[PDB]
């Protein structure tokens, strides 16, 4: 059923009126929006911005600190142990007590060292004892800490403490003295960092290329050992960051007592570093003091306060620097065709390490802006003045920022003078522009995303939203609400000419654009109608994975008056609780039609991986947006070969057609008839423009689509669905935008209300929310906007064709996500342009005044009219990030960069070192290895991905203590090797990227079980039976059934259960059903392990069970500070493993596994279960692990659900889910035959199907792999491509 919603009637829109307006508009002189790129122009922009910046800021003569931890190293650093720590602390404090303090901080250092020396022997025993063996003492109350009362502190120490616990300017970068000082300091630090301090077939290539040219070179550097030392220091800081430990004092010593860390009763943790002065990370002007004891100097730093996100960023600084340097290494070999020299790789490593330890928002913003500044200076025209001006929007405080700014200025001026690409990080020169882009991309990704969302970048977006809303209100008060909403008419533009601004649109332009797009959509009416009707407007709303996800959503207006920040699954459960049925999309929109749209900014502590953007809106708003996007994504799929690229085969046809037509047209000559048969010859040239035209803007108007969808051709016999889309667009026009409690508190805290804060407060008249109109607040209207922009560009093309019929001008365009490429083919006179100007003057004298624009620089007038016609639809081309050039170098990269597939592998490699789920050793290892495999899929070299695998595995083993020589090393408690140990029991797996990418992450355990079976059943080996017993023990510990919504890693042969984070308050509705009820329901409903229920009651039970999943609770509280600190804590000595209904350490689980495996005897059922359980140009080829039989027409989850469907509700849900419900037994027979063919198993036998169905479910899924060449879509072709890419420099075919 579809209601009868009112639509719109076609007004009288004539293309001739717009053509006449364009004639009148082009008859005058129009300013071009972009500036010609010249080295002098860029230099003068930098100089003027320096002069302006230094006069509007308070000048400082003392740069601020940029090194969180200052230290030095002259000898190779041996990693810290508990025994060496005590010896180093004793000798270091003996050194320190022989010093004469002169500052309050140095006095505090002396006092703490004196207290440490005067601790008793039991104090020493309990200080270094594990929490299990720890005993409280009158001086030591927590392990690793000691008590320091105010009696033992001196007057200076007490004064320092009182100052600490009882708590903008810029540097003169225009001056050469500040420049020289900053450059000299950073150059000295970098030079100290670079100073040298005192098998598988892939392994051959690794040890010949990456080990020899990368690892063996950086392994001797000072930065390597400082990275390991900083890892030790940050581990000590993390250990002290515990809830019970942070209230006491701590003292640690590293590098034979040469470095000492003093930790204060710290949220932010406070510490002081005292070190021996030497080569390393030393900034003597930002040190608290330097104490002299003869020929030795000891630098004492200030009290440094650091939070957990920066502490995590500093802990993995060495790994991040090494991964970035390996990426730079791979890109260098791709560019130059050989290996980097030693000095270049050492300098790059030092720069990456310095960037990794200095995590500041200013550096992140600088490296983000550089990514747009580099294209702006390598093109003929761009908006480089604005981008350069953006570099000066924040003060320059530290010397690192000045150094980076000066290097950027030098690089940009050099690039602008060159229209051979200079490198930003070394003395090399690149042959390709992509390498220079990738350098700054890798540098930008070195900065964590945890420093984003601070309490300035949320106020920024609040103010931006409110400012645009107030500008919208001004235009409503000026022209009237009707003109602003319904648009203005063409005769009003011809009389005002101020009406053609952003947030305003012309009705006639919208209708004409819709007509122009109908010209091409009318040849595929049936296809468009079928694509629209295939969106399943009658399918239940909450049975879709996008409507029950973990993405953020707005909740309800609370009693205090604020908008809740909830999850889209909790709101689904809340709706279904009060609803007797599961409504469809249109029925849900009917029910929630009269509820006003609401929006707020997502809380940074409640963000998830599924969250995109900053705004979260209520359920009715998402329903309306989903209606509009189903409709528009259905219509826009039918021009996918022409103007918009989506993915797969039709991901490249748009640009291919556009550029090939441009090249075909340009390879010709034009002839214009001035008089008689005497013609004038013209040379055809091409101009390329890249603009983020489709990108969401806060200053847009959503009402412009209402007349668009009203006039657009959909091929359906009635307007009912079209009118529903119009009405849903009408219901998202006005929104209640709410502030955050954080912003309200921050504004209430300040005493001086700024003039720009007063107006922001007046926007909110009740202090909670204000009305926003026109803007849809980052709501998903991407395909609607892309289609609207395509229609507007087609309207411009028609208008230009009607303007100059005798001129054979050219215009093509393509869209990809927010990016758009426009190609203008213009004419230039051959030889000297005398006949051309004479003809233009004759045309103007004849009354064709619009020929004034086409006189010189035809492409500029083409772009001017295109931009004006786009602005008639409230589309503003960005004057900053739009790039114009006669060739396409920044345009074949920016166009596709922005997709879910063109993401650089740098981000994935650098994110495999953090954000681990914390679900256990096996789950964390699998997550890290899967992230490395994904990075390999995205373009990482096998050697780079292998290095990342090694780094991530070492980090996980260190975290859980399973590395050799550690507490939980499996070989110390099991009678097998470390390679014959199951991954859940502390093993490490294949540890080969080429086998993790092809076979899988958990196939190592299956291979081990295969070896154990084939050894025991053939030779009756005792050790093979021991391995069988270990696997049986793992199966006994935890044997879970596969749920397709679980976010963890599935283990086929058992797992160890680990303690997870317990939030302070459990999620709402999570206690609706008891765990016993959910366990029974899951046992008796095996179909709903592969499909989502369609009924209301079954979907409630399904969603409440999903809410109680430990891998979902973990992902919903991913950014919580408590979980974030819980993941950092070392699980080496913690009782976090489940055994016999009790929480025990991991080595107790290993001892129990050994005991079970010794006294284990194999049975026929066990043997049967074990046998069942063991059975050039960059493109984006998508492959499948084992592919699907052509006879299989339905989806694998649907066939498995049909296999397990028993209840009438389950069978109905399976038939609704299946795309071809009639041919379901035919697919089940085919799958039964295929399983017997390949696996040799019969699924009709009990428990065989339940065990092997997850394998088929994974095999159903497909992956996207970036391959460089003629690689086909088969898995074999991609495997051979990866084997060919095993060598960085030489082909190994």
UniProtKB/Swiss-Prot annotation:
Subcellular location: Host cytoplasm, Host perinuclear region
Cofactor note: For endonuclease activity. Binds 2 Mn(2+) ions in the active site. Displays nuclease activity with Mn(2+) and also some with Co(2+), but not with Mg(2+), Ca(2+), Ni(2+), and Zn(2+). For polymerase activity.
Listed GO biological process terms: cap snatching; DNA-templated transcription; negative stranded viral RNA replication; RNA-templated viral transcription
Activity control: Inhibited by 2,4-dioxo-4-phenylbutanoic acid (DPBA).
Superkingdom field: Viruses
The reaction(s) this protein catalyses: RNA(n) + a ribonucleoside 5'-triphosphate = RNA(n+1) + diphosphate
Assembly mode: Interacts with the viral nucleoprotein.
Protein name according to UniProt: RNA-directed RNA polymerase L
Range of the intact protein held here: 226 to 1600 of 2151
């Amino acid at each position: 059923y579809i209601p009868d919603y009112k639509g719109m009637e076609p007004i009288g829109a004539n293309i001739e009126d717009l053509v006449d307006y364009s004639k009148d508009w082009l008859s005058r002189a129009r300013n071009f929006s972009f500036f010609e790129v010249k080295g002098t122009a860029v230099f003068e922009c930098f100089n003027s911005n320096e002069a302006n910046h230094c006069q509007r800021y308070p000048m400082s003569r003392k740069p601020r600190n940029f090194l969180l931890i200052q230290c030095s190293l002259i000898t190779s650093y041996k990693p810290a142990t508990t025994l060496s720590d005590q010896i180093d602390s004793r000798r270091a404090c003996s050194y320190i007590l022989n010093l004469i303090p002169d500052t309050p901080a140095s006095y505090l250092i002396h006092d703490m060292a004196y207290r440490y020396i005067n601790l008793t022997r039991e104090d020493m025993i309990n200080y270094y004892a594990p929490r299990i063996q720890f005993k409280q003492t009158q001086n030591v109350r927590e392990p690793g800490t000691f008590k320091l009362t105010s009696s033992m502190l001196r007057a200076e120490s007490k004064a320092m403490l009182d100052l600490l616990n009882n708590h903008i300017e810029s540097l003169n970068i225009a001056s050469h003295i500040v420049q020289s000082e900053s450059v000299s300091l950073i150059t000295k630090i970098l030079s100290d960092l670079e100073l040298n301090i005192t098998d598988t077939v892939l392994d051959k290539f690794f040890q010949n290329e990456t080990q020899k040219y990368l690892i063996d070179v950086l392994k001797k550097t000072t930065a390597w050992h400082i990275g390991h030392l900083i890892r030790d220091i940050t581990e000590s800081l993390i250990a002290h960051s515990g809830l019970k430990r942070s209230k006491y004092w701590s003292l640690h010593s590293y590098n034979n007592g040469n470095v000492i860390l003093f930790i204060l009763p710290s949220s932010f943790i406070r510490f002081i570093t005292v070190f021996r002065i030497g080569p390393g990370l030393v900034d003597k002007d930002n040190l608290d003091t330097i104490l002299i004891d003869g020929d030795s100097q000891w630098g004492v730093s200030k009290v440094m306060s650091i939070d957990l996100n920066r502490l995590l960023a500093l802990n993995i600084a060495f790994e991040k620097a090494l991964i970035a340097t390996a990426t730079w290494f791979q890109y260098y070999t791709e560019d130059q065709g050989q290996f980097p020299l030693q000095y270049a790789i050492r300098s790059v490593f030092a720069n990456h390490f310095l960037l990794a330890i200095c995590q500041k928002m200013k550096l992140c913003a600088i490296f983000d802006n550089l990514r747009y500044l580099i294209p702006a200076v390598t093109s003929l025209y761009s908006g480089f003045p604005s981008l350069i001006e953006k570099l000066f929007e924040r003060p320059f405080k530290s010397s690192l920022e000045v150094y980076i700014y000066y290097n950027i200025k030098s690089l940009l001026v050099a690039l602008a003078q060159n229209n051979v690409y200079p490198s930003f990080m070394s003395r090399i020169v690149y042959k390709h522009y992509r390498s220079l882009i990738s350098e700054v991309t890798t540098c930008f990704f070195l900065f964590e995303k945890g420093l984003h969302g601070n309490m300035n970048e949320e106020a920024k977006i609040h103010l931006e939203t409110v400012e645009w809303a107030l500008k919208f209100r001004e235009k409503e008060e000026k022209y009237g609400e009707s003109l602003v909403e319904n648009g203005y008419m063409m005769w009003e533009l011809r009389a005002n000419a101020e009406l053609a601004e952003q947030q305003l649109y012309c009705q006639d332009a919208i209708e004409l654009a819709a007509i122009e797009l109908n010209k091409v959509l009318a040849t595929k009416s049936s296809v468009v109608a079928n694509s629209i009707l295939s969106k399943n407007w009658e399918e239940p709303y909450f049975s879709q994975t996008r409507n029950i996800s973990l993405k953020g959503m707005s909740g309800q207006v609370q009693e205090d008056g604020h908008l809740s920040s909830s999850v889209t699954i909790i709101e689904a459960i809340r709706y279904l609780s009060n609803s007797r049925h599961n409504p469809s999309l249109l029925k849900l929109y009917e029910e929630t039609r009269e509820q006003k749209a609401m929006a707020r900014i997502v809380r940074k502590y409640q963000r998830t991986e599924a969250d995109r953007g900053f705004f979260i809106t209520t359920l009715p708003t998402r329903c309306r947006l989903e209606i509009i996007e189903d409709y528009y994504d259905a219509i826009a799929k039918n021009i996918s070969e022409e103007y918009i690229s989506y993915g797969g085969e039709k991901k490249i046809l748009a640009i291919q057609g556009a550029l090939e037509k441009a090249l075909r047209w340009a390879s010709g000559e034009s002839f214009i008839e001035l008089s008689n048969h005497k013609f004038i010859r013209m040379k055809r040239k091409l101009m390329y423009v890249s603009a983020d035209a489709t990108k969401w803007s806060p200053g847009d108007n959503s009402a412009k689509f209402r007349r668009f969808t009203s006039m657009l051709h959909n091929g359906l016999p009635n307007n009912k669905l079209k009118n529903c889309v119009i009405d849903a667009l009408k219901q998202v026009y006005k929104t209640d935008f709410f502030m955050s409690r954080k912003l309200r508190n921050y504004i209430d805290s300040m005493e001086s209300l700024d003039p720009h804060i007063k107006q922001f407060l007046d926007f909110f008249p009740d202090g909670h929310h204000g009305e926003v109109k026109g803007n849809w607040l980052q709501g998903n209207l991407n395909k609607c906007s892309s289609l609207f922009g395509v229609a507007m560009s087609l309207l411009f093309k028609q208008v230009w064709t009607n303007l100059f019929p005798e001129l054979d001008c050219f215009f093509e365009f393509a869209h990809h996500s927010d990016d758009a490429l426009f190609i203008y083919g213009y004419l230039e006179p051959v030889d000297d342009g005398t006949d051309w100007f004479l003809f233009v003057s004759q045309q103007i004298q004849a009354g064709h005044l619009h020929w004034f624009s086409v006189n010189t620089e035809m492409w500029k007038s083409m772009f001017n009219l295109h931009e004006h016609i786009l602005l008639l639809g409230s589309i503003k081309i960005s004057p900053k990030k739009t790039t114009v050039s006669p060739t396409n170098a920044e345009f074949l990269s920016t166009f596709f960069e922005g997709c879910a597939v063109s993401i650089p592998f740098v981000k994935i490699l650098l994110g495999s070192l953090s954000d681990l789920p914390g679900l256990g050793y096996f789950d964390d290892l699998a997550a890290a290895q899967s992230r490395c495999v994904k990075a390999l899929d995205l373009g990482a070299s096998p050697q780079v991905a292998q290095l990342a695998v090694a780094l991530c595995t070492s980090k996980v083993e260190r975290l859980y203590g399973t590395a050799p020589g550690m507490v939980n090393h499996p070989a110390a408690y099991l009678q097998v090797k470390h390679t014959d140990t199951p991954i859940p029991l502390g093993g490490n797996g294949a540890m080969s990227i080429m086998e993790l990418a092809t076979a899988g992450i958990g196939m190592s355990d299956k291979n081990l079980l295969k070896r154990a079976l084939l050894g025991y059943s053939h030779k009756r080996q005792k050790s093979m039976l021991y391995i069988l017993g270990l696997f049986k023990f793992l199966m006994k510990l935890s044997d879970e059934t596969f749920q397709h919504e679980r976010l963890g890693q599935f283990s086929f042969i058992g797992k160890v259960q680990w303690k997870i984070f317990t939030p302070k308050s459990e999620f709402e509705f999570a206690d609706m059903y008891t765990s016993k009820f959910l366990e029974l329901w899951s046992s008796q409903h095996v179909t709903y392990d592969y499909i989502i229920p369609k009924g209301r009651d079954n979907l409630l039970i399904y969603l409440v069970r999903k809410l109680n999943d430990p891998s979902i609770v973990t992902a919903m509280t991913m950014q919580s500070p408590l979980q974030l600190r819980f993941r950092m804590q070392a699980k080496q000595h913690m009782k976090v493993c489940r055994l016999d209904g009790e929480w025990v350490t991991f080595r107790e689980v290993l001892a129990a596994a050994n005991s079970f495996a010794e006294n284990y005897s194999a049975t026929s059922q066990d043997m049967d279960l074990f046998q069942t359980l063991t059975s050039r140009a960059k493109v984006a080829r998508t492959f499948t692990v084992r592919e699907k039989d052509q006879i299989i027409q339905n989806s694998i989850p649907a066939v498995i659900g049909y296999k397990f469907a028993v209840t009438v509700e389950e069978m109905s849900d399976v038939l609704d889910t299946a795309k071809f419900p009639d041919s379901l037994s035919v697919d089940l027979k085919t799958m039964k035959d295929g399983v017997y063919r390949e696996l040799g198993l019969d699924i009709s036998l009990p428990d065989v199907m339940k065990r092997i169905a997850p394998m088929l479910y994974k095999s159903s899924k497909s992956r996207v792999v970036i391959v460089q060449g003629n690689v086909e879509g088969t898995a074999e072709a991609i495997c051979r491509y990866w084997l060919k890419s095993m060598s960085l420099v030489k082909t190994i075919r």
